[PDB]
Amino acid sequence: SHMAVQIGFLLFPEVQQLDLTGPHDVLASLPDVQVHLIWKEPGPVVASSGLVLQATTSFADCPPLDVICIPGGTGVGALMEDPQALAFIRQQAARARYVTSVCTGSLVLGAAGLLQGKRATTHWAYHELLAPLGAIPVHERVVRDGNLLTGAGITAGIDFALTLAAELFDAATAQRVQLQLEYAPAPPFNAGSPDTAPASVVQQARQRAADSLHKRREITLRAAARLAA
Amino acid sequence: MAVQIGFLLFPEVQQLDLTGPHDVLASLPDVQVHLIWKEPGPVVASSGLVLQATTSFADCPPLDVICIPGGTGVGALMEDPQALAFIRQQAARARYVTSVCTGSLVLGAAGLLQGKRATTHWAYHELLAPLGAIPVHERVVRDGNLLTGAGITAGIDFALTLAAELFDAATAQRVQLQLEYAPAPPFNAGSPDTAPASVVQQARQRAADSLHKRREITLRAAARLAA
């Protein structure tokens, strides 16, 4: 309808698609929501896995949003130094009811200046990069600070989106969606956190991330310097 | 030598049934993931999210794994002889025949649940028995080379189970850690067993028209298998 809650996801090249598609299916289950997939122009955008998604609107044509949500992925490093994307995020965040992210999407909120003095989370492997962007780093899976909600790594988007659903509507509505999703997880292993995974698995995870972390640290301090100037 | 994994992408799919497993399995070494429909190109999910089929039935390579997602669109597939024939063709040689949520009703309409333990979404579980399944109230059910997941988000638990079968436990654990899959749901309403009675009543009330229409489709599909 014309009175729909307006929810926008930034959709960028080399996005981690589950960061977007998990929350999308949760939030699209709510009454009279319109969901936008936003990029520089409408059309196909390829996720890091090769899954092809479709942007529905440009930055220019995007209506004022009630909720803005930034997913993460390999493509965040480019977004953290994209003045056009950062200007769009700051413009929308000025009037949004909620300003939100999943996974390394919070590093883009950081680069836009929106984490200064705010509680935030991100993916466990990149959590050290929050503090240089002025955030108070919190090791919790969904973190609220006023109208800022951030989720931790990839699959945290589902917990994040049910939290946001309760704020937009109420606990009863969020619970109904949880039940419709049959979201009673029973993971076959206990390796979802660096605290519970076998030590061998964490060390491998840390080493495989090392070159990405060193590259993102340099981008992060360039982005921090632009907030300082 | 690459493991060939195929998802059936159909109009009015519940996209998370496909996209959850896709991001888990596409994270594995030496896999190639296909999104299959009658022709390549755009296929719109029940939410309005646009996905893109990568291959026609004809161009689909022999699959190691076939996976049928669920959604509003399964009712049409349960009486689509081309889709059912395609699923039987791939199931014949596939190492694993699989589904998530109401995708198991499509496996049932194809004749592939006869005498097998299976699950589906809690609200549609009564439809498994008429399609010949032994209905099991577990979130991921394995019977030989058949794996079925329960409702929508069960696809993530299903896909990690499958990852360990294709590779090993250590490989599945690495992907679980990369996905930070240590769930902390903000409510305890994911099962009819644990949700408040008011929430169950409302979820059953919303599903009622869909369930009645699927009762009718199911009994026509079962009558075809019998004849």
Numbering used by the authors:
A (entry chain B): -1 to 227
B (entry chain A): 1 to 227
Provide the publication's sentences verbatim:
Upon formation of the catalytic thioimidate intermediate, this helix becomes more mobile and permits water to enter the active site and complete the reaction.
Engineered mutations at residue 150 (e.g., G150A, G150T) also favor shifted conformations of the helix to varying degrees. The refined WT and G150A ICH models are also highly similar (∼0.05–0.07 Å Cα RMSD). In addition, the six WT and G150A datasets show ∼2σ difference (mFo − DFc) electron density features around the mobile helix that indicate a minor population (<10% occupancy) of the shifted helix conformation. The near-identical WT and G150A ICH dimeric protein structures (Cα RMSD ∼ 0.06 Å) provide an opportunity to evaluate the cross correlation coefficient (CCCross) of their diffuse scattering maps. The CCCross for WT-1, for example, can be calculated as the average CC of CC(WT-1, G150A-1), CC(WT-1, G150A-2), and CC(WT-1, G150A-3). We find that the CCCross is ≥0.83 for every WT and G150A dataset, and each data pair within the set of replicate WT and G150A datasets also has CC ≥ 0.8, as shown in orange-colored cells in Table S5.
